Design a protein around this ligand. Structure first.
Ligand code: FES
Ligand SMILES: [K+]
Ligand SMILES: [K+]
Ligand SMILES: [Mg+2]
Ligand SMILES: [Mg+2]
Ligand SMILES: [Mg+2]
Ligand SMILES: [Mg+2]
Ligand SMILES: [Mg+2]
Ligand SMILES: [Mg+2]
Ligand SMILES: [Mg+2]
Ligand SMILES: [Mg+2]
Ligand SMILES: [Mg+2]
Ligand SMILES: [Mg+2]
Ligand SMILES: [Mg+2]
Ligand SMILES: [Zn+2]
Lengths: 161, 162, 99, 38, 40, 38, 177, 174, 100
RNA sequence: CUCGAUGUUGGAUCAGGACAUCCCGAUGGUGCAGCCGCUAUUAAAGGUUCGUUUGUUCAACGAUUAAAGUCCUACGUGAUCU
């Protein structure tokens, strides 16, 4: 009752981690469709409160929700009060569900809108250089353009199939 | 196995020997081509000092090792088990294989220090009073280099020097 | 001069902080930091460490799902590595191709 | 006991034994053969 | 992290490289009109 | 500095040390130890 | 969570009390676990200046186990400051003198070398045996898993386990053993 | 209780009257110090459990002093004891079998001739003293040109360490 | 029966992919604490002739003893309890900014 | 390194340290009978003299001693002295 590769049980006969058995792909494909349908129905029936989203904007990622403010570190060529859509949404989350892009969510699924509320400049930033014993000293002050955005709304549509 | 019994009756002593029950190797080893008990059961590189179920098969009732000619082990495996048994004794994993004490001997109370993976005998090691620089540090050996080829399930190899 | 040079350290220390916080959050779910970050990338989830640290603090249910996803992708990797090519690709291991 | 870097048995009655973590040469016939590993 | 893996899928080692995450427009006008192309 | 030939073993440049470390002989290892086979 | 602001803040920054059992455990692994908790590095809200460390209670510190020959080789050195005040003691000698010193020193050396360290040490509660004061026992929240799995002695194996392990060789019937 | 091996009994507090010669039958002269027990009473008993140490302790006091010069807390302590306040109180480590009820008087005959005792007291106060009187340093010569250096410590350390070791013998209160 | 993480502490995680495979859906409802896993709240905490008055037991402690008491009560070192000088006290911002 | 100065022999005073130990302790060997020695292992807690000539460190000599150790400390120490 011993197979060719049988090893008696010792501390090193088998690996320390437990054995993992993943679900049958055919059975899991059906379970996945059920989960997606359940979450889609929650969207149709409006069973969610406040939403948040992770949006890629101006090279960096922002976790935002309705009424939030974000300080963009450059000018955007938009008048104050102009409303725009943030098109790069990596994630949208609710109390009971979260949708993840691969890497970006489809534009049909989620719509994030924002409004320019201020265009200003940063406070003065000192740039000082110094090297001892070399009569080497310089001083430069820079102010960087900035734009303040208000996140107006995060809306999701029942487009999960 | 064989027992030797001395029975002294009056002025006459009688030394005899009897054959007791002998254990047999389990049937159908997974690797019949194997040349010693270890590789016949695909156990090479897959046992440690705490595998007393394995180690206890190759030792005498009082904790001593059995000859390699009797067990059939190869030199390499025989040496690994020998070191593993020493570590098992020192770790306290063989409480029923203690040395024989002559009648009237009761060891004095000695301080109990839990230890494992003990390469050397405690009394033969000196304190490391001078550790030395980082580039010539005196290290504290842990485990045995004989087990360096044991199967490693981690990405880090066994550290034998602490 | 200190104010000028500190701008480098601010960025460095902020990322160290995010890694520490992500490490803590991952350990609460039995995952080491490298396993989470690495396997999330293999799922084409490009969430950066700043957001991941924010999610751990303020959206713990989303973070547990991300930890579960990384763990699932990690187990699929092991199954694939153990296989000899007979097995099809894992459900979460499939990569969306762009052109 | 003379300290030695290389231990050598000097007669047939010399025997090598490892005690207290180092090798020794002991000889009952000629005690002058006793050596300690240095 | 993940640089070697991305290369194995024919992607840039750095996710800031080529691909939709970087090249696609960041925003558009709320009414639909597309935004002017980004300077980068 | 020291000459190319010295009485002691001269310390190597770190890059050369790494070169030596990476080019060490590696013996052929058999799948099954030959002593474990008939 | 819809809590009020002050209760919400209180909950997030609360001090948790942890229990750790040192029996048969190497002091270093115990210290590695305690150091993280005492600093707060197990919390996603961690920050150096948040003072968010927790309490760690370690019992059975008298029953720690060093690997190798550290009992004989590891030396703890101190200096009274007076001429001739240099003192060096082995781990074994220190352990019999102070049954909490080894674990305490291992933790002290792992904590950050700053002015917060001694404050963190105030949150560490070392007990050489199973006895823990009643007050300390009442505040405990969670016991941490022992880092080292204690190997079973040969006398602790059940006959089922012994029977499951095969006999590997046949001794000669005429061997005295 | 009866005396048992390993038992430690209480001691006394006495006043040092002076010194006196006595002679032994072999002709040898031994000077002795007279110690008078003046109003010695047991004051407090602390059990082994509460002492913070390995043994029980018994507090003894000696010599009556004015109540008009003692702190209120001390006066109320002595009020409950029913004794006048004592100048000095000392703590004696004792075994449990040697406990004595607070308020018991103690007498010189507690000790017997032939016994050996240890006597602890504050040494005579000599104030701030130089190294010669305090530590028995040799000082320096009186002539052959010494400049304002006769009773001084000399060198206090080596040049290398650039500091003075803790415990270094120096002038101070003796 | 496979679950990537235990489902018993924070939420019940269910992971799924859309049919196209471009979106990961995560359903994570909260797990409520079971009633069986709770304790009951400890609500439970002489013909006197004289009205019982409040008695002040707040005996003033000296700095040393006071600091020892505070340090033990809050598991801190003594240092935090000592005062600071005017220079530092007057540098502190008494109207600091407040985010939310 | 120091010359907009890091005071240069021996001694006095006080000594900190190493052990490759002069004495005292514990051991192995001996061409170790004993008494004395020689050699090696271990040991740095404690100790290690006073004099005549010489500026001397040294050296010689007188008388002792259980022994009159070898060295480092800016050839320890002059904001302490000479
Ligand atoms: S012959 Fe195979 S392990 Fe010994
Ligand atoms: K000069
Ligand atoms: K002269
Ligand atoms: Mg970086
Ligand atoms: Mg050259
Ligand atoms: Mg006086
Ligand atoms: Mg004089
Ligand atoms: Mg003058
Ligand atoms: Mg004068
Ligand atoms: Mg100058
Ligand atoms: Mg000295
Ligand atoms: Mg020596
Ligand atoms: Mg000099
Ligand atoms: Mg000077
Ligand atoms: Zn011989």
């Amino acid at each position: 009752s011993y197979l060719p590769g049988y090893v008696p049980k010792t501390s090193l006969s088998s690996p320390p981690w437990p054995e993992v058995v993943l679900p049958d792909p055919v059975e899991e494909t059906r379970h996945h469709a059920e989960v997606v349908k359940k979450v889609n129905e929650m969207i149709v029936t409006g069973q969610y409160g406040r939403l948040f989203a992770v949006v890629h904007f101006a090279s960096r990622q922002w976790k935002v929700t309705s009424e939030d403010l974000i300080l963009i570190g450059n000018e955007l060529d938009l008048a104050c009060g102009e409303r725009i859509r943030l098109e790069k949404v990596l994630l949208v989350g609710a109390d009971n569900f979260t949708l993840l892009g691969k890497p970006l969510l489809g534009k049909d699924l989620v719509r994030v809108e924002a409004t320019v509320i201020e265009k200003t400049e940063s406070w003065p930033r000192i740039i000082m250089r110094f090297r001892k014993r070399k009569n080497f000293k310089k001083k430069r002050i820079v102010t960087t353009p900035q734009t303040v955005l208000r996140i107006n709304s995060i809306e999701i549509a029942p487009c999960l199939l | 196995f064989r027992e030797v019994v001395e029975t002294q009756e009056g002025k006459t002593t009688i030394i005899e020997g009897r054959i007791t029950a002998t254990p047999k190797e389990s049937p159908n080893p997974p690797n019949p081509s194997g040349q010693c008990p270890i590789c016949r059961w695909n156990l090479k590189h897959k046992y440690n000092y705490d595998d007393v179920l394995l180690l206890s098969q190759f030792i005498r009732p009082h904790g001593g090792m059995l000859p390699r000619k009797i067990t059939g082990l190869c030199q390499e495996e025989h040496r690994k088990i020998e070191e593993c048994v020493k570590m098992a004794h020192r770790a306290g994993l063989l409480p029923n294989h203690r040395p024989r004490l002559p009648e009237g001997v009761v060891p004095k109370s000695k301080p109990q220090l839990n230890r494992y993976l003990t390469r050397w005998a405690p009394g033969s090691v000196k304190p490391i009073y001078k550790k030395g620089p980082r580039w010539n540090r005196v290290r504290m050996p842990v485990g045995s280099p004989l087990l360096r080829d044991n199967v490693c399930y981690s990405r880090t190899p066994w550290k034998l020097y602490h | 001069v200190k104010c000028t040079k500190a701008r480098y350290l601010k960025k460095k220390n902020m990322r160290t902080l995010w890694i520490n916080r992500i490490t803590a959050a991952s350990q609460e779910h039995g995952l080491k930091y490298p396993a989470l970050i690495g396997n999330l990338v293999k799922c084409q989830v490009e969430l950066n460490r700043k957001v991941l640290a924010d999610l751990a603090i303020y959206e713990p249910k989303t973070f547990k799902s991300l930890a579960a996803l990384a763990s699932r992708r990690r187990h699929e990797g092991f199954a694939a590595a153990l296989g000899d090519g007979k097995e099809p690709e894992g459900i979460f291991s499939r990569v969306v191709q762009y052109h | 006991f003379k300290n030695k870097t290389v231990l050598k048995k000097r007669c047939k009655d010399c025997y090598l034994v490892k005690r207290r973590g180092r090798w020794y040469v002991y000889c009952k016939t000629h005690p002058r053969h006793k050596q300690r590993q240095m | 992290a993940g640089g070697q893996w991305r290369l194995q899928q024919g992607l840039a080692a750095n996710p800031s490289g080529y691909g939709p995450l970087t090249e696609l427009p960041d925003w558009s006008y709320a009414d639909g009109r597309p935004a002017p192309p980004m300077k980068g | 500095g020291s000459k190319a030939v010295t009485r002691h073993r001269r310390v190597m440049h770190f890059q050369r040390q790494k070169l030596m470390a990476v080019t060490e002989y590696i013996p052929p290892k058999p799948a099954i130890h030959p002593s474990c086979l008939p | 969570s819809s809590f009020s602001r002050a209760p919400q803040q209180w909950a997030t920054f609360a001090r948790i009390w942890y229990l750790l059992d040192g029996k048969m455990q190497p002091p270093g692994k115990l210290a590695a676990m305690a150091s993280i908790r005492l600093q707060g590095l197990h919390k996603p809200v961690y920050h150096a200046l948040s003072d968010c460390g927790d309490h760690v209670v370690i019992m059975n510190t008298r029953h720690i186990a060093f690997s190798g020959n550290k009992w004989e080789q590891k030396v703890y050195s101190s200096h009274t400051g007076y001429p001739g005040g240099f003192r060096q003691v082995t781990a074994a000698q220190l352990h019999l003198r102070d049954p909490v010193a080894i674990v305490k020193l291992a933790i002290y050396g792992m904590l950050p070398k700053n002015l917060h360290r001694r404050t963190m040490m105030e949150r560490l509660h070392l007990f050489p045996d199973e006895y823990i004061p009643e007050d300390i026992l009442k505040n405990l929240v969670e016991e941490l898993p022992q880092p080292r799995k204690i190997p079973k002695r040969l006398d602790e194996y059940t006959q089922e386990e012994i029977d499951a392990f095969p006999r590997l060789w046949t001794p000669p019937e005429d061997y005295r053993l | 209780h009866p005396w048992e091996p390993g038992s430690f009994r209480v001691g006394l507090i006495a006043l040092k009257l002076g010194m006196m010669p006595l002679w032994t039958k072999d002709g040898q002269k031994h000077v002795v110090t007279l110690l008078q027990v003046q109003d010695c009473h047991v004051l407090k008993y602390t059990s082994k459990e509460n002492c913070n140490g390995k043994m029980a302790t018994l507090s003894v006091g000696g010599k009556t002093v004015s109540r008009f010069r003692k702190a209120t807390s001390i006066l109320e302590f002595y009020r409950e004891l029913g004794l006048p306040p004592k100048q000095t109180v000392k703590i004696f480590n004792i075994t449990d079998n040697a406990a004595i009820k607070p308020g018991t008087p103690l007498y010189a005959a507690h000790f017997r001739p032939g016994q050996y005792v240890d006597v602890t007291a504050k040494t005579i106060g000599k104030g701030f003293q130089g190294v010669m009187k305090r530590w028995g340093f040799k000082g320096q010569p009186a002539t052959h040109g010494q400049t304002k250096t006769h009773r001084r410590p000399g060198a206090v350390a080596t040049g290398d360490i650039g500091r003075v070791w803790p415990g270094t013998k120096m002038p101070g209160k003796m | 029966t496979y679950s990537p993480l235990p489902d018993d502490y924070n939420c019940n995680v269910e992971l799924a992919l859309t049919s196209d495979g471009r979106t990961i859906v995560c359903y994570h409802p909260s797990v409520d604490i079971p009633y069986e896993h709770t304790k009951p709240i400890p609500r439970p905490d002489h013909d006197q002739v004289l009205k019982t008055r409040l008695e002040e037991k707040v005996e003033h402690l000296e700095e040393g003893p006071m600091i020892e008491q505070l340090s033990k009560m809050f598991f801190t070192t003594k240092h935090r309890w000592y005062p600071h000088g005017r220079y530092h006290r007057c540098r502190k911002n008494l109207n600091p900014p407040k985010d939310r």
